């Protein structure tokens, strides 16, 4: 089965170097396809960065033709996005994708994507506070973490209906904060994971 999978660091400080991997499964990268890198900024604008062919020929977006390389490891069946230096403007979700050579060149295969944040801010784990109470609403406040993302669930994935996890917001302190809520008839524990800091917190919300 043909699969493309991105992997990367997630957070990179400004002016540092960036290298992302796309591992290809079920097809040799030395045949048929042009292997592309596309990124999606916040605001969802997509920018095509470049490709490398099955022959090992590369073509780059002129917007990037001073810092970009697209290499490949034929023995590992991977290709890479190499950016010599990054700014804060390079914060985006980075996708690998491919099109077959003897076609109208639509991007038929895509990777799941990998999130890249570029900031001088340091990695920090979040503090989880309870949002305690017909119909009742409780939740968890995940505050003061960096970088994104976090993953919240309720009662180890059992509680799934009525749950709303909100997009994080960037506080003036340069750290993120979001809340996750669930509505319920009048034990409940949120499971919050911030893997850049290896934090896994269980927190039980019951009212005072």
């Amino acid at each position: 089965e043909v699969k493309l999978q991105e992997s990367g660091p997630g957070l990179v400080r400004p002016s540092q170097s960036l290298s992302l991997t796309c591992s290809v499964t079920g097809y040799s990268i030395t045949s048929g396809y042009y292997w592309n890198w596309i990124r999606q900024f916040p605001g969802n604008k997509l920018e095509w960065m470049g490709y490398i062919s099955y022959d090992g020929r590369s073509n780059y977006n002129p917007s990037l033709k001073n810092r970009i390389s697209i290499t490949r490891d034929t023995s590992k069946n991977q290709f890479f996005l190499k950016l010599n230096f990054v700014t804060t403007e390079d914060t985006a979700t980075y996708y690998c994708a491919s099109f077959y050579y003897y076609t109208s060149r639509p991007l038929v295969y895509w990777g799941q994507g990998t999130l890249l944040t570029v900031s001088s801010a340091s990695t920090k784990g979040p503090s989880v506070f309870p949002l305690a109470p017909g119909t009742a609403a409780l939740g968890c406040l995940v505050k003061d973490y960096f970088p994104e993302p976090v993953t919240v669930s309720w009662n180890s994935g059992a509680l799934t209906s009525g749950v709303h996890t909100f997009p994080a917001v960037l506080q003036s302190s340069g750290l993120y904060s979001l809340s996750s809520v669930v509505t319920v008839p009048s034990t409940y524990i949120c499971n919050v994971n911030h893997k850049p800091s290896n934090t896994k917190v269980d927190k039980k919300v019951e009212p005072k």
Partner: peptide
């Protein structure tokens, strides 16, 4: 939370 999916080509 998902990559773009191809709908129409050409």
């Amino acid at each position: 939370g998902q990559p773009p999916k191809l709908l129409i080509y050409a």
